[PDB]
Design a protein that fits this description.
Blueprint (H helix, E strand, L loop, with lengths): L1 E4 L10 E4 L1 E9 L5 E9 L6 E6 L13 E9 L5 E9 L4 E8 L5 E6 L34 E2 L1 E5 L8 E9 L5 E12 L30 H14 L27 E5 L2 E5 L5 E2 L1 E4 L9 E2 L2 E2 L26 H4 L3 E2 L2 H5 L15 E4 L10 E4 L1 H10 L6 H17 L20 E5 L7 E2 L9 E2 L4 H18 L5 E6 L11 H4 L1 H7 L7 H14 L2 H8 L6 H4 L12 H29 L17 H10 L3 E4 L13 H4 L3 E5 L20 H17 L3 E6 L30 H18 L3
Parallel strand pairs: 9-10, 17-29, 23-26, 27-28, 28-29
Antiparallel strand pairs: 1-13, 2-5, 3-4, 4-13, 5-12, 6-9, 6-13, 7-8, 7-12, 8-11, 14-15, 15-16, 18-22, 19-20, 21-22, 24-25
This protein binds a molecule of 2 linked components (GAL-AAL), beta-D-galactopyranose, 3,6-anhydro-alpha-L-galactopyranose and calcium ion (3 copies).
EC number: 3.2.1.81
Organism: Saccharophagus degradans (strain 2-40 / ATCC 43961 / DSM 17024)
InterPro entries: Agarase_CBM (IPR040669), GH (IPR017853), Glyco_hydro_42_N (IPR013529)
Length: about 750
């Protein structure tokens, strides 16, 4: 054991730094039962979107002797709210890792983050874009048993330079309430011996955490039917009152009815308006489909037996149907990864009734396999639950139960990425989506973790966009039940870290020649029109270029310091790029679906530069944002006033680890009950915000315990678990919320 901070000297140490937080020392009751001194941390996290502490020693700590060690903290929350801490650990080289956990109120516990050894020793597949551990899980189960709680892996470098640890930071970010905790006994402990079965036998035959019994866990087929039967008894298909046919408000004003979902401002607040003229507000869940419900098993087939992707396809591999596997494929089954295969206590044989829930993926964003067999436990359970009278009948059953669930829960919509077989449900509105993919030219932003950005000035981008919109139009059949269309998702436009980050598309593209790069030519044209002469450009940018043609050879603007004049041109360049994306996209959607709302490209918190946002404001009927935070702080969202566009949250969630999962997700609660409470706080901030016309939750079901095929997300982010059994705390929170969306929003 190596003690760093026990606070028994009664000082707030001068090498801890606090931001929008108050520190003091207090007596409290320690884990062991004795009164100890502790650091009480009162974060002003309601008023400020970033709060916490950072310990920064005089000199970086040298911990290089600790080749198998964890950093421990004792922590508890005080007051009314659980706390999600982010832990950021910085070495002397500017490498940092980020872990996170929930800190409940009540019982104090010990928390640990690995500095070295065990599942860090070989960390991933070698690939920079891999956030997962080498297991293909975003965060693994513990590598030893203890009552202590492992800080959950999020992102960053796994193996820091232990000779120089420069900063340890604990922060509360974008909270809706003030958070207060007590911290004690910050220390280093050598890791105990590694449990070499830690990745062995994780999953039981139902897809659940096999080594943990937890409240609500399924133990036999009979418990699965009894849970099914209690629910099928409660589901009648009656919506909350008094909804109109399209889930709009009966009891409000009645507006113009165009026969399509559209936008209008009511009482100073943006709303949707349903096809019959009633005020509408969108609530619901994303990923109402099976595509993301399979997990890599570790087996592969002969390539000759697997159908290849067509270059024409509008659907990227992550969003494809589950691939039915043929016998000829299955008969060539071989072990590509021992680590994956050993995780499962049960996979079926080819003749077994549940053998149709195998999948094959021909690519993956990340994880230790680039391709391979997968299995959908969720899908298997649908068949366990509902049987298969004719092939795939449990699918029709599921869809019909899903629609009943959504109406019972008071939701007004089926959210993004709803399977298209629900597009004629004709009982609840839905959101449609498409992706523009293909072999058009590309540009780099410096952080394209999911592929290079589109060259939107290349005519082949338009061709592909047109095709994308054609396929959506064919899917939705001009339906009034379609609220509107999302195109794409969190495109990597530019990050807000730095100028080099935000302006990466302009900067990188300026560096290339104009020849063969349509986006470069467009930038060239704009710059030519603003400046006309190479001298005027030379003066603006502080350059010595001999001509426009030298300039068109490509210019390295990386070392130039960003003056105001330079920033205006970066901005103007980013703006024209985004304008062109949104023009092409809007154009295609409008050509095919003249009547439907175009809903944007779903801006993540890490990819909404104001230039791109303002571009979306021009062309999209509704600006969509993804926002994985406790809620919508006023200060982070004040910019909306200047746009005055109706807006929508495409994604958000909160998860916990009390129901078998090893990763709560992006935002963490202390329990199933706390999740539901944290859901209400988020939604409340949506509801109070006069620019938002809806918010969707990501997603319907938990991701597979051993992580989704695509990228290893293994999150407790469902309204239902892998057995298709709903989280009642989530259900109840959604009923409370969905009960007041109209009355509160439009009310007195
Ligand atoms: O001028 C701002 C910079 O000052 C540098 O001296 C400092 O190293 C750098 O800090 C870092 O910021 C992010 C990029 O790499 C990591 C490092 O801690 C961090 O993730 C920056 O603050
Ligand atoms: O490592 C990439 C990650 O960066 C962080 C961000 O909040 C995540 O959303 C993810 O994009
Ligand atoms: O905002 C979060 C979500 O989780 C993965 C991606 O980046 C981070 C995004 O989908
Ligand atoms: Ca103490
Ligand atoms: Ca997937
Ligand atoms: Ca079957």
């Amino acid at each position: 054991s190596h003690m760093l901070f026990d606070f028994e000297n009664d000082q707030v140490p001068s090498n801890i730094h606090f931001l929008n937080a108050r520190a003091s020392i207090e007596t409290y009751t320690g884990i062991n039962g004795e009164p100890s001194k502790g650091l009480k941390l009162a974060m002003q996290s309601k008023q400020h979107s970033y709060t916490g502490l950072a310990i920064v020693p005089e000199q970086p700590w040298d911990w290089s002797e600790f080749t198998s060690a964890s950093l421990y903290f004792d922590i508890v929350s005080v007051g009314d709210h659980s706390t999600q801490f982010y832990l950021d650990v910085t070495d002397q080289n500017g490498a940092v890792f980020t872990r996170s956990i929930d800190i409940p109120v009540g019982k104090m516990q010990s928390y640990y983050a690995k500095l070295s050894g065990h599942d860090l020793e070989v960390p991933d597949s070698g690939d920079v874009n891999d956030l997962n551990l080498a297991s293909g899980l975003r965060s693994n189960p513990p590598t030893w048993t203890s009552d202590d709680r492992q800080f959950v892996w999020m992102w960053g470098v796994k193996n820091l330079d232990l000779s120089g640890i420069a900063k340890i930071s604990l922060s509360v970010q974008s909270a809706m309430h003030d958070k207060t905790v007590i911290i004690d006994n910050i220390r280093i402990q050598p890791n105990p011996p590694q449990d070499e079965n830690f990745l062995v036998g994780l999953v039981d035959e139902f897809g659940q955490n096999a080594k943990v019994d937890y409240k609500g866990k399924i133990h036999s087929l009979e418990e699965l039917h009894a849970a099914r039967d209690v629910e099928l008894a409660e589901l009648d298909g009656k919506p909350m009152p008094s909804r109109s046919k399209f889930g709009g408000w009966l009891a409000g004003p009645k507006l113009k009815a165009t026969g399509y979902f559209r936008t209008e401002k009511i009482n100073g607040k943006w709303m949707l308006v349903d096809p019959e003229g009633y005020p509408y507000f969108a609530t619901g869940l994303d990923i109402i489909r099976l595509s993301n419900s399979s997990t890599m098993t570790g087996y592969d087939y002969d390539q000759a037996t697997v159908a290849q992707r067509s270059a024409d396809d509008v659907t990227p591999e992550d969003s494809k149907g589950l691939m039915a596997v043929s016998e000829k494929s299955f008969a060539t089954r071989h072990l590509a990864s021992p680590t994956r295969a050993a995780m499962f206590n049960w996979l079926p044989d080819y003749d077994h009734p549940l053998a149709n829930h195998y999948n094959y993926r021909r690519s993956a964003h990340s994880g230790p396999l680039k391709r391979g067999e997968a299995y959908s436990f969720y899908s298997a359970n649908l068949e366990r639950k509902y049987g298969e009278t004719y092939p795939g009948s449990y699918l029709d059953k599921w869809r019909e139960v899903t629609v009943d669930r959504m109406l019972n829960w008071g939701f007004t919509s089926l959210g993004n990425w709803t399977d298209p077989a629900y597009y004629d449900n004709n009982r609840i509105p839905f959101f449609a989506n498409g992706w523009v993919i293909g072999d058009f030219k590309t540009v780099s932003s410096g952080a394209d973790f999911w592929g290079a950005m589109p060259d939107v000035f290349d005519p082949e981008f338009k061709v592909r966009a047109m095709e994308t919109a054609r396929v959506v139009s064919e899917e939705i059949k001009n339906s009034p039940w379609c609220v509107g269309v999302f195109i794409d998702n969190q495109k990597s436009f530019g990050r807000p870290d730095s100028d080099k980050a935000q302006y990466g598309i302009p900067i990188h593209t300026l560096g290339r020649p104009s020849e063969g790069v349509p986006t470069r030519q467009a930038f060239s044209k704009l710059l030519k029109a603003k400046y006309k002469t190479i001298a005027a450009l030379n003066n603006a940018w502080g350059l010595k270029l001999s001509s426009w043609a030298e300039f068109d050879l490509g210019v390295d603007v990386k070392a130039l310091p960003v003056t105001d004049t330079l920033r205006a041109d970066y901005s103007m360049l980013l703006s024209a790029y985004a304008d062109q994306y949104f023009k092409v996209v809007h154009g295609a959607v409008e050509h095919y679906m003249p009547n439907h709302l175009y809903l944007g490209a779903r801006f993540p918190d890490w990819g909404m530069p104001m230039e791109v946002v303002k571009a979306a404001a021009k062309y999209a009927d509704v600006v969509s944002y993804n926002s994985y935070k406790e809620g919508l702080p006023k200060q982070k969202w004040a910019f909306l006033a200047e746009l005055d566009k109706p807006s929508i949250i495409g994604e958000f969630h909160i998860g916990a680890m009390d129901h078998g999962s090893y990763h709560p997700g992006l935002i963490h609660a202390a329990s199933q009950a706390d999740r539901g409470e944290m859901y209400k706080d988020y939604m409340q901030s949506v509801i109070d915000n006069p620019y938002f016309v809806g918010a969707h939750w990501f997603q319907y079901m938990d991701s597979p315990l051993t992580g989704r095929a695509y990228d290893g997300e293994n999150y407790n982010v469902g309204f239902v678990d892998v057995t298709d059994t709903p989280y009642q705390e989530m259900v109840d929170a959604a009923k409370e919320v969905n009960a007041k969306i109209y009355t509160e929003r439009l009310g007195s």
